[PDB]
Amino acid sequence: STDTVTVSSPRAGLVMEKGAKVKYRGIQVGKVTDISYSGNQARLKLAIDSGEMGFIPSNATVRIAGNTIFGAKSVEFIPPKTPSPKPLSPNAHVAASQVQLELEHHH
Amino acid sequence: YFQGAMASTDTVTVSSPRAGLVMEKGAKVKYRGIQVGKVTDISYSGNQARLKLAIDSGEMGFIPSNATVRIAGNTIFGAKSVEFIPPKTPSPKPLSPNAHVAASQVQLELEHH
């Protein structure tokens, strides 16, 4: 059985592999189940063993490893220098060198 | 193959040059301001990132074959694990069953290879 614990994030833009390990002194104790996105704040839903929490004081602290990555939002097609009369065959593919990763502009 | 009844949309795939692309749900596909499709799935293999798409078959007769791909987005934090640290002077009280920890106690380190 598990007890649900929660954590608010310093960065609202936090993505995490659904159901990732939760460690303490090297041993796993639970997993993250859900991630809530209320407004411009992010809060984590944790779930850890119902009896293991006796080994974690209330005033503990948290470390989250990770990387800075690109959170895409949409995908647009762009008309070229000269448009080809041929349309797009199904199952076709566009390589990486034809893809442009962009930042959106904020007022 | 065999014929589809209705609303039969086709697929087109995209290679992301930077492995590490995650994508927001509700990801739609546009072309000159018209929404034409959606994104099915995402996968990773080798050191590359695949993308499968779903575009309405009728709207593909208008997308040129030599069209480039634009992908908007914002840089975000790609978390991997959650760890706990014993405070310098720990509290005798164990963790309450429904405890909350705001951003104050959370620390967001980068990874090492």
Author numbering:
A (entry chain A): 39 to 145
B (entry chain B): 32 to 144
What's written in the study?
The mammalian cell entry genes (mceA–mceF) encode the substrate-binding proteins of the lipid-transporting Mce complexes in mycobacteria. In terms of lipid transport in Mtb, Mce proteins are characterized as ABC transporters. It is now well demonstrated that Mce1 is involved in the transport of mycolic acid/fatty acids and Mce4 imports cholesterol. A common feature of each of these proteins is that they all contain a conserved domain of approximately 100 residues, now referred to as the MCE domain, which is characterized by a seven-stranded β-barrel fold, although the sequence identity of these domains is very low.
